[PDB]
Homo-oligomer: 140 residues x 2
């Protein structure tokens, strides 16, 4: 019924269209890295300009929002009811919903930096640990 | 004020304690892989049992929930008000909140498999594209 419209509104509110940005950036940085890698005359950077446009168009063919959007709507309409999607929209339309969306990438990154920093403390003991098992079983 | 209690309830509802499970699994699979790698007498698997317990205890020292929990509460209480955290708890306590929490890992995985599958279609054209730029600039 009116589920697809609510699913579409959800993907907009959640900025699911920007999920591909890392792929477009990686291919753009790869070309400039390939341009530098050999020769690199800054007088011919307009040649890199068209090859970066070509790569952008080729990604748009495979992973453009118009290709992704239909299959994500099927994903949400099959997993949620029209009423559930409407309520998800009400939450993400709300000031708190918008606050969660902006904070989440940074909160996730800060949360992961914290754990990775702490985990480095277990590197030396786990290295010693495996070395002791290899010693005990008679290895090297 | 009563923010820390609400932050603690949030981390419980969201299962932030299970965020470390991949690290514990990787270190457990690494020891069994190291056990197989050289010799491997199944009569001495009780030796791997204690080394896997040792590794579990060493990770608990660095990245145990008791070490992670205090710094995540500071993260949420500084980024959200007590009232905002209370409302986040109301949403994730609700049947729809619980449905979102269960669906999200699978919806994220399915969403990423879809994009990666489509992206493989742009592999050959982007490879040809870079090869043509290397050809045009006079490389190999
Ligand atoms: Cl609100
Ligand atoms: Cl509900």
């Amino acid at each position: 019924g009116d589920s697809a419209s609510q699913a579409e509104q959800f993907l907009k509110l959640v900025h699911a269209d920007k999920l591909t940005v890392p792929v477009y950036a990686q291919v753009q940085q790869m070309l400039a890295q390939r341009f530098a890698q050999a020769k690199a005359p800054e007088s011919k950077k307009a040649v890199l300009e068209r090859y970066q446009a070509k790569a952008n168009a080729e990604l748009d063919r495979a992973i453009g929002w118009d290709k992704i959007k239909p299959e994500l709507i099927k994903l949400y309409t099959t997993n949620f009811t029209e009423s559930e999607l409407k309520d998800l929209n009400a939450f993400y339309q709300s000031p708190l919903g918008k606050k969660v969306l902006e904070k989440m990438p940074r909160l996730t990154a800060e949360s992961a930096q914290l754990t990775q920093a702490k985990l480095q403390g277990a590197v030396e003991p786990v290295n010693k640990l495996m070395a002791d098992m290899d010693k005990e079983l008679g290895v090297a």
